[PDB]
């Protein structure tokens, strides 16, 4: 409950975040800005560069989508491992652990996705490639509409200039949301989130002392996340109806089953 308890929690989460997520914001920024700690990506900006890129790194929009499913499944695996490290999470009723993961994992995906983006495109294939926003926008409907709202969010989110240590606490706050539909015991979840929110506030005060009220502004961003999810779900429903040769991977299918 004291500051030292809050710092210890911040430290624990950052340590777990680094252990759980092999591609950090620090690495993403090093790739994107040309630092010598990391290597230059191959840039895919049209159909030709895409074909050459697969060699360097079934309509194309569908192949890209199926690749997205696999990255997303990996993301869920990483996020689940991380969630289990949040103090108190694995002590919750198992139904609630499942519910929290079900509603939270994509909110986390879009949050961390911002780390891989700038206004012009997104890192892919563990940072080995970079696919432009213009190219993704050019994919046939409805595949061309998947990424744009995520890019719009990312530009706004990236303006906050958070680092990995900040993000570690923020994503924990997202997971421990007491307002998820169908939760059985809201209070112990809120008890954990209250601790995480305090730890995040202190972390932001110490790590960005010249960023006044960064905490409140960060919380402002969480509104956009649920809207991204809502819009995304509508696009998935279209795909389900128009592309019968495809289904979501079973883990993703479970996540979206009876969501909202």
Ligand X SMILES: CC(C)(Oc1ccc(CCOc2ccc(/N=N/c3ccccc3)cc2)cc1)C(=O)O
Select the residue interacting with ligand X from 21, 42, 89, 215 (CB under 6 A).
21
**Among residues 16, 78, 157, 176, which is the contact residue for ligand X, using CB under 6 A?**
78
* Residue 71 in contact with ligand X, rule: CB under 6 A: yes
Rg (CA), the chain: 19
Based on CB atoms, which residue is closest to ligand X, 109 or 197?
109
The answer for residues whose C-beta is within 8 angstroms of residue 42's C-beta and 6 or more apart is 49, 53, 56, 57, 128, 129, 130
Q: How far is the CB of 185 from ligand X (least distance, A)?
A: 27
Does 97 contact ligand X by CB under 6 A? no
Considering the rule CB under 6 A, would residue 109 count as an interface residue with ligand X? yes
200-259 binders of ligand X (CB under 6 A) = 232, 236, 248, 252
Residue closer to ligand X, measured from CB, 89 or 146 = 146
Contact 180, 157 (CB under 8 A): no
| Residue 75 interacts with ligand X (CB under 6 A): yes or no | yes
Q: How far is the CB of 40 from ligand X (least distance, A)?
A: 20
Contact with ligand X (CB under 6 A) among 113, 175, 200, 204: 113
- Ranges of beta strands (E only) in the chain are 42-44, 117-118, 121-124, 129-132
Q: After which residues is the chain broken (C to N over 2.5 A)?
A: 57
Supply the DSSP symbol for 116: G
- In the list 10, 28, 31, 79, the residue contacting ligand X (rule: CB under 6 A) is 79
- Residue 219 CA to residue 136 CA, distance in Å, equals 29
Binding residues for rosiglitazone, as ranges, are 69-72, 106, 232, 256
| Residue 235, phi then psi, degrees to nearest 5 | -65, -40
Nearest to 218 by CA among 255, 169, 185, 148: 169
- Binding to ligand X (CB under 6 A) within 41-70 occurs at 68-69
Residues that bind ligand X (CB under 6 A): 21, 68-69, 71-72, 75, 78-79, 108-109, 112-113, 146, 150, 232, 236, 248, 252
């Amino acid at each position: 409950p004291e500051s030292a308890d809050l710092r210890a929690l911040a430290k624990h989460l950052y340590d777990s975040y680094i252990k759980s997520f092999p591609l950090t914001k620090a690495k993403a920024r090093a790739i994107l800005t040309g630092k010598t700690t990391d290597k230059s990506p191959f840039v895919i900006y049209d159909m030709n560069s895409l074909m050459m890129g697969e060699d360097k790194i079934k309509e194309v929009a569908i192949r890209i989508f199926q690749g997205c499913q696999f990255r997303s499944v990996e993301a869920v695996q990483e996020i689940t491992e991380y969630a289990k490290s949040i103090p108190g999470f694995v002590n919750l009723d198992l139904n609630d652990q499942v519910t929290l993961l079900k509603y939270g994992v994509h909110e986390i995906i879009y949050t961390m996705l911002a780390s891989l983006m700038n206004k012009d495109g997104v890192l892919i294939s563990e940072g080995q490639g970079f696919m432009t926003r213009e190219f993704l926008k050019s994919l046939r409907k409805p595949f061309g509409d998947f990424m744009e709202p995520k890019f719009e969010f990312a530009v706004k989110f990236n303006a906050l200039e958070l680092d990995d240590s900040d993000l570690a606490i923020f994503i924990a706050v997202i997971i421990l949301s007491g307002d998820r539909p169908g939760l059985l015991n809201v209070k112990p979840i809120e008890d954990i989130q209250d601790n995480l929110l305090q730890a995040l506030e202190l972390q932001l005060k110490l790590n960005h002392p010249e960023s006044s009220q960064l905490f409140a502004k960060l919380l402002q961003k969480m509104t956009d996340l649920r809207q991204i999810v809502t819009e995304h779900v509508q696009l998935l429903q279209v795909i389900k109806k128009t592309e019968t040769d495809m289904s979501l991977h079973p883990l993703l299918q479970e996540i979206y089953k009876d969501l909202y």
